[PDB]
Amino acid sequence: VSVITSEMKMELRMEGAVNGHKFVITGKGSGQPFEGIQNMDLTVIEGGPLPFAFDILTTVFNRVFVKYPEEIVDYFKQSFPEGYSWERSMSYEDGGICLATNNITMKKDGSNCFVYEIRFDGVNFPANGPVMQRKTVKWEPSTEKMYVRDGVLKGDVNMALLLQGGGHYRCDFRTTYKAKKVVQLPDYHFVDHRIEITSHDKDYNKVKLYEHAKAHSGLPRLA
Amino acid sequence: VSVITSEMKMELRMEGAVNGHKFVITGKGSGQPFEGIQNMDLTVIEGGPLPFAFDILTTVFNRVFVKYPEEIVDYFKQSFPEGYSWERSMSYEDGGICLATNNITMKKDGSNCFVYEIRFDGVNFPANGPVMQRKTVKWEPSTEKMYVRDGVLKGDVNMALLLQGGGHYRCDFRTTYKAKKVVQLPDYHFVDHRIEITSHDKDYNKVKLYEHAKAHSGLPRLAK
Numbered sequence: 001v002s003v004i005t006s007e008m009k010m011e012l013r014m015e016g017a018v019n020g021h022k023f024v025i026t027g028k029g030s031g032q033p034f035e036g037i038q039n040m041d042l043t044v045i046e047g048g049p050l051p052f053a054f055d056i057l058t059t060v061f062n063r064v065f066v067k068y069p070e071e072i073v074d075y076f077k078q079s080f081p082e083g084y085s086w087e088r089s090m091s092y093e094d095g096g097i098c099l100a101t102n103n104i105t106m107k108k109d110g111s112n113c114f115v116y117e118i119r120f121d122g123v124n125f126p127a128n129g130p131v132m133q134r135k136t137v138k139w140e141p142s143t144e145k146m147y148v149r150d151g152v153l154k155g156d157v158n159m160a161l162l163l164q165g166g167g168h169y170r171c172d173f174r175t176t177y178k179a180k181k182v183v184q185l186p187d188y189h190f191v192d193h194r195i196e197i198t199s200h201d202k203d204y205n206k207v208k209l210y211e212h213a214k215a216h217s218g219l220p221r222l223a
Numbered sequence: 224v225s226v227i228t229s230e231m232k233m234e235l236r237m238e239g240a241v242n243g244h245k246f247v248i249t250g251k252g253s254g255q256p257f258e259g260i261q262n263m264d265l266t267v268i269e270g271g272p273l274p275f276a277f278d279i280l281t282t283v284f285n286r287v288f289v290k291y292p293e294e295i296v297d298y299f300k301q302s303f304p305e306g307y308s309w310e311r312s313m314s315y316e317d318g319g320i321c322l323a324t325n326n327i328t329m330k331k332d333g334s335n336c337f338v339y340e341i342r343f344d345g346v347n348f349p350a351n352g353p354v355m356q357r358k359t360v361k362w363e364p365s366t367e368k369m370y371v372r373d374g375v376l377k378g379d380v381n382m383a384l385l386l387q388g389g390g391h392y393r394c395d396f397r398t399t400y401k402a403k404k405v406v407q408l409p410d411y412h413f414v415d416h417r418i419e420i421t422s423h424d425k426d427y428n429k430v431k432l433y434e435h436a437k438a439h440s441g442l443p444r445l446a447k
């Protein structure tokens with residue numbers, strides 16, 4: 001049985017470092033779990049102005065916000081109220097790499113609100129690279145491949161940051177999702193994503209985010 | 224000019240998390256920079272008993288402790304007293320991966336003491352893997368390849384953890400060393416290493432570490 005409802009909020013706190021630069025970011029928002037859409041506002045409270053592209057952080061700021069077809073098992077909506085946590089490695093093509101974790105829980109006061117505890121760490125970003133030089137434009141939409149591995153769920157996705165001077169900067173995501181309780185495991189499937197920074201101030205101390213995501217079973221064999 | 228001396232101590236604090244498990248470790252020791260040997264004692268002050276193999280942390284607990292021949296430029300001994308920092312990605316063959324940073328400075332009192340500020344983070348280690356199951360024996364000795372890249376120094380090394388059930392568990396290190404001041408840059412070279420946990424209690428809350436390292440320019444082209 002799922003305790004998820006049509007309108008739910010989320011509050012989060014991210015603590016991290018990129019190339020040794022520490023920072024803390026908090027955020028709050030709301031989303032529609034069954035429609036796979038969500039929005040939130042982020043605030044850099046420590047470490048601002050960030051010397052790296054804010055885009056490397058956006059996919060860290062919850063797969064519960066995915067419209068899952070009735071025929072596909074929803075690993076995430078089943079996990080609450082206890083929740084789940086996830087770990088992820090984000091390997092960029094120029095050697096830069098980031099690791100992140102998010103422990104997601106649900107308030108039991110009936111406020112239909114998620115709480116995220118996030119850690120983000122990145123190293124080896126070249127000084128003249130698009131991340132440290134903040135030359136990224138956005139993440140392109142993507143299709144994450146979901147598959148079970150040793151009782152837990154893995155999600156792999158080929159990501160790409162569109163660059164200001166044109167062209168793309170690739171990053172490979174390897175995420176492991178871990179439900180805090182026993183839930184039904186899904187068969188191999190996909191989750192299409194489209195994340196966007198809808199608004200931000202000059203130094204990205206204030207950022208508005210939006211994401212639309214929908215799960216599916218791939219292209220039908222019949223045209 | 225180098226301010227490095229024969230006998231120097233080091234104090235450190237490591238804060239980190241592995242698969243979401245937080246921990247804090249402090250340590251203190253002493254070493255001989257010119258001889259490339261050092262020893263230290265570590266204490267887990269938070270997060271114990273660690274649920275993962277302590278070995279994944281040992282190479283994070285200073286390339287100043289390397290015997291450098293006179294012919295090879297020593298990027299590290301040149302950097303002090305200001306010091307240097309390093310960043311590293313440690314990619315294991317089963318998908319597990321750790322990132323670490325170490326900011327190294329020298330005491331402000333002439334006590335010949337280094338101070339390390341360390342952050343360690345690892346994720347994606349399989350529950351049944353040698354790290355989470357603590358089936359590692361030790362790191363095998365290694366040879367790190369040092370090369371300059373965009374004004375800073377890179378060090379890449381093929382590492383391997385000997386496992387209890389025999390066989391090895393490979394990890395590829397990618398380190399970037401950044402001097403806090405302008406120093407002379409070295410030509411491509413190598414640093415041989417041999418790190419070992421010389422003593423530890425049952426749950427590794429207390430650990431004694433030793434490392435011997437020496438730089439060189441590779442095998443001579445002429446045999447004999």
Ligand SMILES: [Mg+2]
Pocket residue numbers: 136137138
């Ligand atoms: Mg922008």
Ligand SMILES: [Mg+2]
Pocket residue numbers: 359360
């Ligand atoms: Mg042992």
Ligand code: NA
Pocket residue numbers: 071072073185186187188
């Ligand atoms: Na399914």
Ligand code: NA
Pocket residue numbers: 294295296408409410411
């Ligand atoms: Na040299």
